[PDB]
Amino acid sequence: CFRARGYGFRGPGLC
């Protein structure tokens, strides 16, 4: 999404 757009914080893993 954001920092999980490169998963871990915001996105892909958790967008």
Side-chain angles (χ1 to χ4, degrees):
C1 237
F2 251 112
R3 198 42 36 125
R5 167 266 182 210
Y7 2 62
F9 293 94
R10 325 196 164 113
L14 51 136
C15 204

PDB file of all heavy atoms in Angstrom:
ATOM      1  N   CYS A   1       0.871  -1.192   0.000  1.00  0.00           N
ATOM      2  CA  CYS A   1       0.000   0.000   0.000  1.00  0.00           C
ATOM      3  C   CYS A   1       0.893   1.223   0.000  1.00  0.00           C
ATOM      4  O   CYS A   1       0.982   1.991  -0.939  1.00  0.00           O
ATOM      5  CB  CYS A   1      -0.834  -0.062   1.281  1.00  0.00           C
ATOM      6  SG  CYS A   1      -2.603  -0.031   0.865  1.00  0.00           S
ATOM      7  N   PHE A   2       1.598   1.330   1.072  1.00  0.00           N
ATOM      8  CA  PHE A   2       2.607   2.401   1.295  1.00  0.00           C
ATOM      9  C   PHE A   2       3.930   1.777   1.694  1.00  0.00           C
ATOM     10  O   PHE A   2       4.779   1.514   0.865  1.00  0.00           O
ATOM     11  CB  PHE A   2       2.065   3.288   2.419  1.00  0.00           C
ATOM     12  CG  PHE A   2       1.646   4.616   1.851  1.00  0.00           C
ATOM     13  CD1 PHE A   2       0.294   4.965   1.820  1.00  0.00           C
ATOM     14  CD2 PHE A   2       2.612   5.495   1.340  1.00  0.00           C
ATOM     15  CE1 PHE A   2      -0.099   6.193   1.278  1.00  0.00           C
ATOM     16  CE2 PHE A   2       2.220   6.721   0.795  1.00  0.00           C
ATOM     17  CZ  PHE A   2       0.862   7.072   0.765  1.00  0.00           C
ATOM     18  N   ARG A   3       4.124   1.532   2.954  1.00  0.00           N
ATOM     19  CA  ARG A   3       5.394   0.930   3.364  1.00  0.00           C
ATOM     20  C   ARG A   3       5.275  -0.573   3.335  1.00  0.00           C
ATOM     21  O   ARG A   3       6.253  -1.304   3.400  1.00  0.00           O
ATOM     22  CB  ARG A   3       5.661   1.537   4.722  1.00  0.00           C
ATOM     23  CG  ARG A   3       7.147   1.382   5.098  1.00  0.00           C
ATOM     24  CD  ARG A   3       8.062   1.678   3.889  1.00  0.00           C
ATOM     25  NE  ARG A   3       7.400   2.773   3.126  1.00  0.00           N
ATOM     26  CZ  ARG A   3       8.056   3.871   2.866  1.00  0.00           C
ATOM     27  NH1 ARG A   3       9.015   3.861   1.979  1.00  0.00           N
ATOM     28  NH2 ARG A   3       7.765   4.969   3.503  1.00  0.00           N
ATOM     29  N   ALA A   4       4.088  -1.010   3.061  1.00  0.00           N
ATOM     30  CA  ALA A   4       3.878  -2.462   2.805  1.00  0.00           C
ATOM     31  C   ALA A   4       3.526  -2.594   1.356  1.00  0.00           C
ATOM     32  O   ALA A   4       3.125  -3.630   0.882  1.00  0.00           O
ATOM     33  CB  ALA A   4       2.866  -3.135   3.759  1.00  0.00           C
ATOM     34  N   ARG A   5       3.815  -1.556   0.611  1.00  0.00           N
ATOM     35  CA  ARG A   5       3.641  -1.692  -0.832  1.00  0.00           C
ATOM     36  C   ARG A   5       4.911  -2.467  -1.195  1.00  0.00           C
ATOM     37  O   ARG A   5       4.984  -3.278  -2.100  1.00  0.00           O
ATOM     38  CB  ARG A   5       3.624  -0.277  -1.375  1.00  0.00           C
ATOM     39  CG  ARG A   5       3.757  -0.302  -2.893  1.00  0.00           C
ATOM     40  CD  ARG A   5       5.225  -0.154  -3.276  1.00  0.00           C
ATOM     41  NE  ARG A   5       5.227  -0.148  -4.760  1.00  0.00           N
ATOM     42  CZ  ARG A   5       6.258  -0.606  -5.405  1.00  0.00           C
ATOM     43  NH1 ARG A   5       6.602  -1.856  -5.272  1.00  0.00           N
ATOM     44  NH2 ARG A   5       6.947   0.191  -6.171  1.00  0.00           N
ATOM     45  N   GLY A   6       5.807  -2.338  -0.266  1.00  0.00           N
ATOM     46  CA  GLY A   6       7.048  -3.119  -0.157  1.00  0.00           C
ATOM     47  C   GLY A   6       6.681  -3.726   1.195  1.00  0.00           C
ATOM     48  O   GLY A   6       6.876  -3.120   2.222  1.00  0.00           O
ATOM     49  N   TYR A   7       5.937  -4.799   1.163  1.00  0.00           N
ATOM     50  CA  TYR A   7       5.285  -5.345   2.388  1.00  0.00           C
ATOM     51  C   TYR A   7       6.103  -5.287   3.654  1.00  0.00           C
ATOM     52  O   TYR A   7       7.316  -5.263   3.683  1.00  0.00           O
ATOM     53  CB  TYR A   7       4.946  -6.814   2.116  1.00  0.00           C
ATOM     54  CG  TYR A   7       5.418  -7.263   0.750  1.00  0.00           C
ATOM     55  CD1 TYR A   7       6.786  -7.249   0.433  1.00  0.00           C
ATOM     56  CD2 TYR A   7       4.484  -7.695  -0.197  1.00  0.00           C
ATOM     57  CE1 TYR A   7       7.209  -7.664  -0.835  1.00  0.00           C
ATOM     58  CE2 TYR A   7       4.909  -8.110  -1.461  1.00  0.00           C
ATOM     59  CZ  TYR A   7       6.270  -8.096  -1.778  1.00  0.00           C
ATOM     60  OH  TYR A   7       6.687  -8.509  -3.025  1.00  0.00           O
ATOM     61  N   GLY A   8       5.338  -5.255   4.702  1.00  0.00           N
ATOM     62  CA  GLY A   8       5.861  -5.187   6.084  1.00  0.00           C
ATOM     63  C   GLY A   8       5.075  -4.110   6.844  1.00  0.00           C
ATOM     64  O   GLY A   8       4.754  -4.264   8.008  1.00  0.00           O
ATOM     65  N   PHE A   9       4.782  -3.005   6.197  1.00  0.00           N
ATOM     66  CA  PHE A   9       4.037  -1.893   6.894  1.00  0.00           C
ATOM     67  C   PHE A   9       2.677  -1.563   6.272  1.00  0.00           C
ATOM     68  O   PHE A   9       1.655  -1.688   6.907  1.00  0.00           O
ATOM     69  CB  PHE A   9       4.985  -0.711   6.834  1.00  0.00           C
ATOM     70  CG  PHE A   9       6.169  -1.034   7.702  1.00  0.00           C
ATOM     71  CD1 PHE A   9       7.309  -1.608   7.132  1.00  0.00           C
ATOM     72  CD2 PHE A   9       6.112  -0.802   9.080  1.00  0.00           C
ATOM     73  CE1 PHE A   9       8.399  -1.944   7.939  1.00  0.00           C
ATOM     74  CE2 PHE A   9       7.205  -1.133   9.889  1.00  0.00           C
ATOM     75  CZ  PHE A   9       8.347  -1.710   9.319  1.00  0.00           C
ATOM     76  N   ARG A  10       2.665  -1.096   5.058  1.00  0.00           N
ATOM     77  CA  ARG A  10       1.367  -0.729   4.375  1.00  0.00           C
ATOM     78  C   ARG A  10       1.222  -1.297   2.933  1.00  0.00           C
ATOM     79  O   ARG A  10       1.684  -0.674   2.014  1.00  0.00           O
ATOM     80  CB  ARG A  10       1.343   0.793   4.322  1.00  0.00           C
ATOM     81  CG  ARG A  10       2.004   1.376   5.572  1.00  0.00           C
ATOM     82  CD  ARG A  10       1.638   2.857   5.702  1.00  0.00           C
ATOM     83  NE  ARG A  10       1.981   3.221   7.107  1.00  0.00           N
ATOM     84  CZ  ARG A  10       2.956   4.056   7.353  1.00  0.00           C
ATOM     85  NH1 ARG A  10       2.936   5.258   6.843  1.00  0.00           N
ATOM     86  NH2 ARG A  10       3.948   3.691   8.116  1.00  0.00           N
ATOM     87  N   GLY A  11       0.547  -2.424   2.687  1.00  0.00           N
ATOM     88  CA  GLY A  11       0.383  -2.874   1.243  1.00  0.00           C
ATOM     89  C   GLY A  11       0.754  -4.328   0.937  1.00  0.00           C
ATOM     90  O   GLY A  11       1.250  -5.040   1.781  1.00  0.00           O
ATOM     91  N   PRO A  12       0.501  -4.697  -0.333  1.00  0.00           N
ATOM     92  CA  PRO A  12       0.829  -6.057  -0.799  1.00  0.00           C
ATOM     93  C   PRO A  12       0.603  -7.094   0.272  1.00  0.00           C
ATOM     94  O   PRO A  12      -0.396  -7.784   0.258  1.00  0.00           O
ATOM     95  CB  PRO A  12       2.277  -5.843  -1.189  1.00  0.00           C
ATOM     96  CG  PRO A  12       2.203  -4.543  -1.935  1.00  0.00           C
ATOM     97  CD  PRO A  12       0.974  -3.818  -1.411  1.00  0.00           C
ATOM     98  N   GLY A  13       1.460  -7.199   1.228  1.00  0.00           N
ATOM     99  CA  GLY A  13       1.177  -8.177   2.285  1.00  0.00           C
ATOM    100  C   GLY A  13      -0.070  -7.671   3.012  1.00  0.00           C
ATOM    101  O   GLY A  13      -0.971  -8.427   3.336  1.00  0.00           O
ATOM    102  N   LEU A  14      -0.094  -6.394   3.306  1.00  0.00           N
ATOM    103  CA  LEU A  14      -1.255  -5.815   4.055  1.00  0.00           C
ATOM    104  C   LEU A  14      -1.850  -4.480   3.508  1.00  0.00           C
ATOM    105  O   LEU A  14      -2.210  -3.629   4.305  1.00  0.00           O
ATOM    106  CB  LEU A  14      -0.664  -5.592   5.427  1.00  0.00           C
ATOM    107  CG  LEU A  14       0.639  -4.829   5.224  1.00  0.00           C
ATOM    108  CD1 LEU A  14       0.742  -3.707   6.233  1.00  0.00           C
ATOM    109  CD2 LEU A  14       1.830  -5.780   5.345  1.00  0.00           C
ATOM    110  N   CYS A  15      -1.983  -4.256   2.219  1.00  0.00           N
ATOM    111  CA  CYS A  15      -2.580  -2.941   1.756  1.00  0.00           C
ATOM    112  C   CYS A  15      -3.949  -2.736   2.407  1.00  0.00           C
ATOM    113  O   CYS A  15      -4.914  -3.389   2.055  1.00  0.00           O
ATOM    114  CB  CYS A  15      -2.777  -3.084   0.249  1.00  0.00           C
ATOM    115  SG  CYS A  15      -2.804  -1.453  -0.577  1.00  0.00           S
TER     116      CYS A  15
END
